[PDB]
Amino acid sequence: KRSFIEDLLFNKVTLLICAQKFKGLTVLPP
Amino acid sequence: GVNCTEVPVAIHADQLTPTWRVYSTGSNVFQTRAGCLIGAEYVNNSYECD
Ligand SMILES: *[C@@H]1O[C@H](CO)[C@@H](O)[C@H](O)[C@H]1NC(C)=O
Ligand SMILES: *[C@@H]1O[C@H](CO)[C@@H](O)[C@H](O)[C@H]1NC(C)=O
């Protein structure tokens, strides 16, 4: 449930390296 | 951050760093996006977060 401008904002900004991080480095979810 | 098919295989003697393996065979197991919860049942109503 998003509008047009929200869809554009989500598409424009983009976020194996995470798999490579076996060295005790994790990212928690919000 | 562990798929919850690892802790049931972890149910053994001297096959896990934490000692309290007895609690692995505990209560209803729930799947979340940050791991899996052991010992808490999942109702499907809504409240204010505690
Ligand atoms: C664990 O992996 C299996 C792959 O067979 C998948 O079906 C399941 O949804 C996953 N569960 C969790 C909690 O990651
Ligand atoms: C909530 O969980 C109960 C468990 O038996 C189920 O019967 C019911 O249909 C569920 N309600 C919804 C809205 O998923």
UniProtKB/Swiss-Prot annotation, chain B:
Record-annotated disulphide pairs: 4-36
Glycan-modified residues: 3, 44
Region Disordered: start-end pairs: 8-27
Quaternary structure and interacting proteins, as annotated: Binds to host ACE2. RBD also interacts with the N-linked glycan on 'Asn-90' of ACE2. Cleavage of S generates a polybasic C-terminal sequence on S1 that binds to host Neuropilin-1 (NRP1) and Neuropilin-2 (NRP2) receptors. Interacts with host integrin alpha-5/beta-1 (ITGA5:ITGB1) and with ACE2 in complex with integrin alpha-5/beta-1 (ITGA5:ITGB1). May interact via cytoplasmic c-terminus with M protein. May interact (via N-terminus) with host bilirubin and biliverdin, thereby preventing antibody binding to the SARS-CoV-2 spike NTD via an allosteric mechanism.
Record function comment: Attaches the virion to the cell membrane by interacting with host receptor, initiating the infection. The major receptor is host ACE2. When S2/S2' has been cleaved, binding to the receptor triggers direct fusion at the cell membrane. When S2/S2' has not been cleaved, binding to the receptor results in internalization of the virus by endocytosis using host TFRC and GRM2 and leading to fusion of the virion membrane with the host endosomal membrane. Alternatively, may use NRP1/NRP2 and integrin as entry receptors.
Protein name in the entry: Spike protein S1
Organism listed in the record: Severe acute respiratory syndrome coronavirus 2
Organism lineage: Viruses, Riboviria, Orthornavirae, Pisuviricota, Pisoniviricetes
